Amino acid sequence: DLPKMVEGVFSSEIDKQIQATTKFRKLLSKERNPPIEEVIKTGVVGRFVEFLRSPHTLVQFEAAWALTNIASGSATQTQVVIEAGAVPIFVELLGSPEPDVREQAVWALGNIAGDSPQCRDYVLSCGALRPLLTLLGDSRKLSMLRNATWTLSNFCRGKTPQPDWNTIAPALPVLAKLVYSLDDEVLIDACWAISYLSDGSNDKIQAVIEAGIPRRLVELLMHASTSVQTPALRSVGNIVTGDDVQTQVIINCGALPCLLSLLSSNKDGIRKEACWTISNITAGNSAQIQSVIDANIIPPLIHLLSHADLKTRKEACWAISNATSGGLQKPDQIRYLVAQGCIKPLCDLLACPDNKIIQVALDGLENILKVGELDKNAASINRYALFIEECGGMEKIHDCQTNANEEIYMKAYNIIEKYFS
Amino acid sequence: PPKKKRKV
Amino acid sequence: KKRKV
């Protein structure tokens, strides 16, 4: 009975407080549709926050659990807990002598920070990160390690805005240790946290590298669980969006044979992100393109160019086109791409409704044509231009002149002028 | 990757 | 030349 429970919570006797708070905790823990709104309307949330400072650890714990579950709700329900002043006290409780209280405070802060980037930043501003990281280095209890890694991943999550970098960067040496966890849940959440932190400017990627994280990430690419593979792969993909030296760390850690394997993943999303990752490697220097070629990645990429879903094809298109960038330095790369059958699938992509894909396919084809012309002058026709012509490719380049954009139908015109006139 | 978790 | 998320 709710009114009697409220009466108990507003009592000054610890036993009545605990009995009533426990009843609220149980209400808020029910299987479906906890009556969070109803509980808030009774006005007990402020009392729960008071109980967090009680010398009786049991009422601390029960109140923390009730508050955790109120914060598991909507943005406005979470705001009720914030407004009541729970967060600075939860941060203090991360240093409680009682492990169950510490653990519940971790969970509450996870829920609150999980609500939004703004809530995340408020939690960080109250100094939650350092005591959380300390727990992650000290605890031997699996449930705590799991909960604290999850909460840490929420401290790292979000892009509107990203958290302050110097504020969150202390997480990296701790995450570097967590990716060696023997527990899959810790592994998954640590990898997700890294996937958030590694998405951004290259100084952030450098920080990830200097923490020593890439080597284990590359090893986790072949983890049995797709739930580990996915954020590990997103992280590796983020790192190769860096400069050539940063990208080379990933190659040197042995990622290319892993990436070859991941192209045959049973998960569409993994195949797609593997293609994306490879594309940012073939966006690299001549030696890095050569590494991808030497890793036997080009034939499966060309396969995926034609088969697989549109999102995967788009990524494969970038990968193959990027690899045509070295026609001046090492034209043998393009001649190999052509020998492996890249021309027809690139031409078929000229009818893609996405203008970005059209431009990228045209870029690759022009790069191909330049080498074909080069081969002609040393010999007498452009063999590649002939290839494009009889596969129906020339017509598709011709229809690109009515594209209405800019660098596309200009590109298409110049190609027809220089190669098909 | 849930953003929030309710305890029990 | 790199495409970030």
Numbering used by the authors:
A (entry chain B): 82 to 460, 466 to 507
B (entry chain C): 125 to 132
C (entry chain A): 128 to 132
Sentences from the paper on this structure:
Importin-α (Imp-α) is the receptor for cargo proteins that contain specific nuclear localization signals (NLSs) that play a key role in the classical nuclear import pathway. Impα is composed of tandem armadillo (Arm) repeats that generate a curved and elongated shape. Impα also contains conserved residues that form two NLS binding sites known as major (Arms 1–4) and minor (Arms 4–8) NLS binding sites. Monopartite NLSs primarily interact with the major binding site, whereas bipartite NLSs interact with both minor and major NLS binding sites.
The crystals are not isomorphous to other Impα/SV40 complexes and diffracted to high resolution (1.75Å), which is the highest resolution obtained for an Impα to date. The final model of the NcImpα/SV40NLS complex consists of 428 residues of NcImpα (79–507), the peptide ligands bound to the major (seven residues) and minor (four residues) sites, and 349 water molecules. The structure exhibits an elongated and curved shape composed of ten tandem Arm repeats, each containing three α-helices (H1, H2 and H3;), as observed in other Impα structures. The SV40 NLS peptide binds the major binding site of NcImpα in an extended conformation with an orientation that is antiparallel to the Arm repeats. The average B-factor of the peptide at the major binding site (33.2 Å2) is lower than the average B-factor for the protein (37.7 Å2), indicating stability for the interaction of the peptide at this site. The crystal structure of NcImpα resembles other Impα structures but exhibits a conformation that is more concave compared with MmImpα.
